[PDB]
Design a protein around this ligand. Structure first.
Ligand SMILES: Nc1ncnc2c1ncn2[C@@H]1O[C@H](COP(=O)(O)OP(=O)(O)O)[C@@H](O)[C@H]1O
Ligand SMILES: Nc1ncnc2c1ncn2[C@@H]1O[C@H](COP(=O)(O)OP(=O)(O)O)[C@@H](O)[C@H]1O
Ligand SMILES: Nc1ncnc2c1ncn2[C@@H]1O[C@H](COP(=O)(O)OP(=O)(O)O)[C@@H](O)[C@H]1O
Ligand SMILES: Nc1ncnc2c1ncn2[C@@H]1O[C@H](COP(=O)(O)OP(=O)(O)O)[C@@H](O)[C@H]1O
Ligand SMILES: Nc1ncnc2c1ncn2[C@@H]1O[C@H](COP(=O)(O)OP(=O)(O)O)[C@@H](O)[C@H]1O
Ligand SMILES: [Mg+2]
Ligand SMILES: [Mg+2]
Ligand SMILES: [Mg+2]
Ligand SMILES: [Mg+2]
Ligand SMILES: [Mg+2]
Lengths: 372, 372, 372, 372, 372
């Protein structure tokens, strides 16, 4: 009878809210900030740790740590702080009266999911819980039942093909290139113009620059020639202290790492080749149905040139008699949460919750037998 | 008073319909498909088994099984599924109000016919039923009363000679070489050009290739020399994913196994020698009447060179003073069903039905005393 | 008068040497490594491509490519580099004074053998050459004349039955599951414990882990229960940078894909069912003689549980009144080369060489008429 | 002075040996086996043709041909191979120092005997030779001088009456129904239980089944009722690959074709009616002497119910005042050879040999004037 | 034919000389001194700017400015003065007859290198010019071809890993903590004992104190407790005017900022953690070869405790099964110049010079395509 909770815990952003809603109620950056300097004023309240938007607002005197690195939770006390902020401070609910739906990247370690179940059942003891794959939730929110989902967030870029509600786990591809690596490459290539960003708050400044100014070029070499010829692609950004920086080719050399991973010294192929290799790893009779249903999800896929570029590259890779369609909804930054809210409100889902007596009987191993 | 049902249950295609019609109403492939992958999206309909055209439409995520192998039913639950799809889903009738005519290959095991009678009288309980030989039905649909019928389908190729309505059972020849063996041979010889087809859906793709592109050469050695000399016999086929394959001599090296079974390591003789041996096993005075009435039936005899080649080979085998005629009607793919509809509408056939009280009195053994 | 050369060119290892020897002189991995990073120091010799053990020794700065994939040569310049390293750098001989014996997998494309003939007669112009089937060479090295050979290497697992020196080509069954697929599956299941291997040098690291620590369980479910109960099956491996990884059930879940191909999403049956179906595809009177002479060959058949497991599975499949014997010699990793050395030293083989004038007269087609 | 040779050349077994012996030294099946598959292993001697027991031991890779079909030799090179195996390989003698006694069926073609004389005088040139009727040799081995011999072998069943050493050629009956037809009928009716035997080696397996398990029922309809009621007549046979088949009524349906030829679609009467018609075609005063001396010979008369059944059928046919006796010695499988050894050792037979000068003077026609 | 020039222009010292020499001919401080007071004595030679050792000798009446700050040139007229003093006053050569090799820190702005090329080709117009990375020159002077170079000078501390002459640019780390920051930290913490330094000449006095008296403690807490317990670590320095100062823990608290950057309010990690993170950012198989070849270079690495402390810290960070070696040659203060002299004297380097026609054709952008 009670309303479920959907808490998409990504590598860079936590999106929490209620099942059945259209948009997540709480979207906050998943950071924990701790003071690096010394406190000299007595009476003012300086907490030992700042979580979320409070860490971003006071980031000049804080060292910021991300508890999730490349989809895997590395700090567990910090993720306890993140979940405590998400439940009590933002959603303002008690977790013992609401089942909670959680998301997880494919090809993740089993200890991550087991400890997620253990913390969600013993610290904030929920009546029931479930772990879902983020790409299945993206396909749920897209409204279709077939397609290959390219989900690129802050730590993990993964391709999952699903045909008629059936997943093909041997064709699931995972690549550790996402928005944090693009941010770091922007820190590296911003020093070529003389702008130095070294601290963790400057990483957030560079991330804001990347979010507001970067774009994907349709042709990389023609854009390189155009940027070297004329200064028509240069844009100016105002720093928080007041300085104005100007960037030229770095607006499109930063997300080009998504298509040329060798820019950051990785042997892997681009996202278009990863998508094509995931399609040709499937059975032949479904491949056409995977060609016309390329679904984009995640915040890294929000550059304003990426759909046409992926369409052009996959059309160059696929045979010419096939129709290539890239499904890029405008709400695809939150599509994993929207699909989680769709799934948690279904009447056929209520018997697949992992309840507290099943966790008491089986221990933290029921999540490998009731979830994929 | 009620209309009878004719249900030709071949090894590869089930053709069902009403007595008195010209063409069968429901022609669907006799396969049962079961999901091999895992289902991850809930709410939409996932059945445990897909039967017929639905199994062909979703064959990329299914393992397809044929319930009938070489004319003998191996899976009986799958055969019940096939009959249930034929009666309720395709013909949309209740089997308890219609007598049913079924077909069977010659020299078949008795337990096959007994279990067919048992299921057709206890599961879909019909008022009456009958089992007929397919070659007699082919001769019924041809409009003649004498001739030798070469029926080649998906599992069984059989020659049956009938003179003036009198069958000669000692000259009936059965050879286990038909369209599935030709499909498997095409799958084997397609790997010489680098095309690999290993799954059960790829078997259906190769079967479509064989149906669309293969033909019987009039002279095998001259056609092999022509294919080795110039690329005028090469044809291109578009795969379901979009790739284009090209085949040369494999257009005629695949049905040549009908005339040279040693291509697939079989000691038996070709269909022309089987026909000649079945003719020469009969009485001498009828042999001339069997020479001018060679009736072709079944889907395997639909290659566009087989009548001239069969004519040439029998004319080489028979003495030169005899006229050799190959009767190849254009509707011979469905001629067994057409003859079943002709027989089931006859006024002299209505007293040869096996009724339900006779089955109750005699058990599943009346079919050996009322049917040939 | 001159000594012949035997060069087994498999998908993962090249084994070259002289005829009449007991062990191959040069066993090196068949890879070509090319530098991915940039060279900043001049003066030292930095070649454009590294072949063999030199590519393995410097693999941290190289992208490694296999020229042969699933028994089929895909890169021909790289294969020319492999053969040039085999002849001049390892064997240290001139190829124009020695005939060369080559091996090939069954059911291979004809263009592979034709281009092998063209390069072996026009680039390294040998006086004569021959292409042999690897399973025939394995039966030559076993010393027997009858038996079914399961040869599993790096790309191809094939069963070939030979009775009294007569092969049955219709019962030859080829399956594209071998040690590279097991290495990829070990990559996929090593991420469950948090170990990430993505690069091509990490493929060699995972392959060394598989070669050193994996084994075939006699009973998979009992070993699953034993590994889940106690940590007595866990083994530790030291990585090249000093980290120690620990693996438990992955020691026997990796070669279990040989018996359950559905672990990597393949519709095919296991190697035991492949062997049983190859035996039952033969004639009846030889089947008992194929039951007691199961010959194992190749490096993939070197797991220390595979003979007992294959014995148990085939004894479960075969009727109980036949004796099942699995012939697993300790030198079966090199048995194809040993059989090639036995064959090339035979006095009755010297008239079966494909000489250079026959190649000049017939062109790239004599290898289909003088070899099987 | 030299020892003569007796070589009974039946349609299914060649029995050769020396005159004056009690049992033939060499009994081997008269088949020629030729390899149907390809040879891949060079070094071992693979002969082009296998004759006799070597063809039976390696029959899984051979096509087997019988040189004699229905008493008449069709392949003469194969009979040269059979005689060369009989003289040099089995008897281990040279034919040029031994006269040879040969047997032939009654009512045979004259060119068969002429070519037998031509081959026995020009290829294996003997000092002398003779052709005798097999039934006269059976009467010689029985020790009597009067009686009617029913000789049924592998191709020909013939009744010959002889009274006081005087043959009656007008009452000699030849019927083309023997053990090969019974083997073919058993091969046909074994498919009713689902056992398929189509190759030539499977014909030998079915012949072994017929030899080991078949019997003649005293009453056919009572045995039908007994087999249909209870499974007390069912017997199990082990196939060479280990499968166990079970046969019921087919143990007595197969030799019932000897009494009801219409089971294989043949217009002729049974062996009992043939014997009665041969007796009634003779003079009346000898008929009683033919009633009490029915001599059985040949391997087809070795069923363990045939003497009582034949006695019952003739006693039903003959008048009740005549005594009916069926002489069935236990050595009647070899009785033709035993009678040939008795005849060739006689002192009064040495003047009836056809010598080489008589053959040179008269040409291939002396055998029609010196033999019956 | 003419001798090239090697001019290492560091942030605090300019080392110029000829190629092929073992030691640089001219080592002078890169400062420009301008008179802050007024001139009253006419006739005395008073220049407007003093460069090099003349600025150091008269620093009591001069304000000293460094043209290079943190590896980036800020004053270009002063840089021209430094180069003019380096060529005409110290080396006493004409730059138009000698090619010049220059050094630059990694991750530097492109405009710095472009203006370096422009001044090098238009003000002191050289026949040819090259710009090289200083860590590659340190590895050149070490005599090895693999290793990770930690170069710490006056403005920039950078780690560059090189394996077999191949650099890994994604693992190159740059940290803006060097000897000028340590001089400022000692300048700050010398006020705790009552010694006040505020001016630019007093900065040179503090730099001399740091060069002569500071050292790196192996254990910081134990040395702090030892200095607090007994005054055995105190040392006395004589000021230029005559006063004697005494320092205690400041001998090891000043270079401890190299290992604890938070002493100067910097969020970055120490040089040992920077070295470890640069090693683990490389590929796995080279990491061992980077562990045993830690090459120290630059004047900041000349403290007499830094090799053992770096060895201890990296051994604490690395896994315990590996050998850690710190290569600290005694000539590592000038190792960049020695490597530049080695590189410029190589015969394989003479085609990598950027000549004057290439600069005239391409403009000041050829230095990004011919240099790294
Ligand atoms: N407008 C934008 N353009 C490009 N990148 C964006 C934009 N908005 C967000 N991002 C990137 O998306 C990443 C997070 O996306 P999302 O998947 O929603 O969060 P998470 O990865 O934590 O689940 C951030 O690292 C950010 O850099
Ligand atoms: N046009 C065609 N050319 C060649 N083969 C065909 C053609 N149409 C059908 N076939 C073959 O006929 C086989 C089945 O024929 P049919 O006798 O109608 O069905 P069944 O054997 O099930 O009774 C199929 O295996 C198919 O490969
Ligand atoms: N001791 C071992 N245990 C298990 N697998 C092994 C072992 N040694 C080698 N292999 C596997 O054998 C494969 C190659 O074997 P082999 O057949 O000799 O080479 P190729 O396939 O090139 O002919 C490699 O992929 C390797 O993974
Ligand atoms: N014990 C037996 N029971 C039934 N049939 C037998 C038996 N022994 C031999 N036969 C049959 O007798 C036939 C040959 O008998 P025989 O006359 O000895 O040889 P041939 O006809 O060649 O002279 C064979 O086909 C065999 O099937
Ligand atoms: N013996 C020493 N002990 C400590 N620091 C030193 C020593 N010698 C030189 N330094 C420091 O090294 C810095 C410059 O070193 P170097 O790298 O040779 O010059 P640059 O940085 O200009 O290339 C100076 O700031 C100086 O303080
Ligand atoms: Mg996400
Ligand atoms: Mg049919
Ligand atoms: Mg191999
Ligand atoms: Mg006989
Ligand atoms: Mg320096």
């Amino acid at each position: 009878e009670t309303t479920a909770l959907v808490c998409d815990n990504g590598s860079g952003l936590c999106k929490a809210g209620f099942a059945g809603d259209d948009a997540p109620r709480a979207v906050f950056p998943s950071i924990v900030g701790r003071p690096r300097h010394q406190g000299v004023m007595v009476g003012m309240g300086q907490k030992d740790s700042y979580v979320g938007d409070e860490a971003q607002s006071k980031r000049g005197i804080l060292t910021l740590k991300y508890p999730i690195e490349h989809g895997i939770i590395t700090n567990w006390d910090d993720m306890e702080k993140i979940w405590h902020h998400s439940f009590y401070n933002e959603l303002r609910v008690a977790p013992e009266e609401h089942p909670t739906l959680l998301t997880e990247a494919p090809l993740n370690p089993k200890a991550n999911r087991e400890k997620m179940t253990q913390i969600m059942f013993e610290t904030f003891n929920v009546p029931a819980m479930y772990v879902a794959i983020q790409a299945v939730l993206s396909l749920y929110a897209s409204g279709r039942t077939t397609g290959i989902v390219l989900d690129s967030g802050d730590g993990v870029t993964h391709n999952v093909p699903i045909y008629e509600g059936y997943a093909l786990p041997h064709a699931i591809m995972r690549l550790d290139l996402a928005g944090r690596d693009l941010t770091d490459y922007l820190m590296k290539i911003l020093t070529e113009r003389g702008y130095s960003f070294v601290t963790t708050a400057e990483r957030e400044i560079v991330r804001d620059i990347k979010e507001k100014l970067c774009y994907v070029a349709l042709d990389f070499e023609n854009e390189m020639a155009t940027a070297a010829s004329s200064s028509s692609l240069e844009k100016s950004y105002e720093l928080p202290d007041g300085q104005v920086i100007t960037i030229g080719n770095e607006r499109f050399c930063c997300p080009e790492t998504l298509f040329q991973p060798s820019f950051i010294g990785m042997e892997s192929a681009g996202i278009h080749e990863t998508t094509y290799n995931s399609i040709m790893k499937c059975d032949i009779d479904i491949r056409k149905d995977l060609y016309a249903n390329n679904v984009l999800s995640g915040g890294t896929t929000m550059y304003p040139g990426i759909a046409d570029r992926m369409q052009k590259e996959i059309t160059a890779l696929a045979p010419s008699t096939m129709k290539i369609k890239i499904i890029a909804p405008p709400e695809r930054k939150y599509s994993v949460w929207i699909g989680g809210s769709i799934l948690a409100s279904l009447s056929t889902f209520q018997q697949m919750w992992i309840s507290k007596p099943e966790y008491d009987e089986a221990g933290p191993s029921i999540v490998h037998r009731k979830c994929f």
